[PDB]
Amino acid sequence: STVPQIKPFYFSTTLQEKQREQITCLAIAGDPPLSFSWTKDGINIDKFSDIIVETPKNFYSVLVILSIQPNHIGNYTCIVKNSVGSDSFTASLILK
Amino acid sequence: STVPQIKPFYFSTTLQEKQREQITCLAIAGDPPLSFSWTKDGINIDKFSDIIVETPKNFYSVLVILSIQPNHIGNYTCIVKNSVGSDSFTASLILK
Ligand SMILES: *[C@@H]1O[C@H](CO)[C@@H](O)[C@H](O)[C@H]1NC(C)=O
Ligand SMILES: *[C@@H]1O[C@H](CO)[C@@H](O)[C@H](O)[C@H]1NC(C)=O
């Protein structure tokens, strides 16, 4: 009865290489079952083997990078879907 | 030789009752092993039956609220520790 709704997530503004990073695509509202999916620059997050993606609970999914390095720059987009609707959010990983 | 450093976390600005919430205390920098602790309004998070606290990986801790109620208002503090230093961050939960 409730359309999914994603809490905004961000990468660190002071990101430096070899640091660790985590973002959570949290569905603050939305009736389960919910389907989470990730893309980086329009590419399936599959193709980036340095990135770990999990769905530990049925209402959020987590993206983790153990050692940030130049190839991780891009726009990371998460999409959540259910019976009644969808939602999406994008965050940009930048390296100064 | 690297002291812990927490990546900032925030609760939703548009929080409403019975919604779900998650915050991650990520040690963006710091040598393992890392020890995570939580307090709400200075009280051990142990005492709050309706709050789930886990350490899914050894470099970030997760605080999860399945259904938000008025009791959950307060300032939540994470404290990370290792051999050579510690860090702290506080995010406050508001119900408009
Ligand atoms: C996508 O990412 C590129 C580089 O990562 C950035 O310059 C651009 O502003 C982003 N586009 C959108 C629509 O967010
Ligand atoms: C913590 O929240 C209390 C109200 O519960 C308030 O008095 C105090 O100013 C807050 N602390 C900070 C640092 O905002």
Author numbering:
A (entry chain B), B (entry chain A): 0 to 95
Show sentences the authors wrote.
Chelicerata sDscams could be classified into two subfamilies, sDscamα and sDscamβ, containing one and two variable Ig domains, respectively. Crystal structures and cell aggregation assays demonstrated that both α and β subfamilies of sDscam used Ig1 for the isoform-specific trans recognition in a hand-in-hand manner.
The crystal structures of sDscam Ig1 from both M. martensii and L. polyphemus revealed a common assembly of antiparallel homodimer for both α and β subfamilies of sDscam. More interestingly, in some Ig1 crystal structures (M. martensii α1, α7, and L. polyphemus α7), the two protomers within a homodimer were related via a 2-fold symmetry axis, namely, these two protomers had identical conformations. This implied that the homophilic trans interactions of Ig1 were also symmetry-related. Similarly, sDscam Ig1 also employs the ABED face to form an antiparallel homodimer. Moreover, all the Ig1 isoforms without exception have a potential N-linked glycosylation site (NXS/T) located at the F strand. This glycosylation prevents the CFG face from establishing homophilic interactions and helps define the interface of the sDscam homodimer.
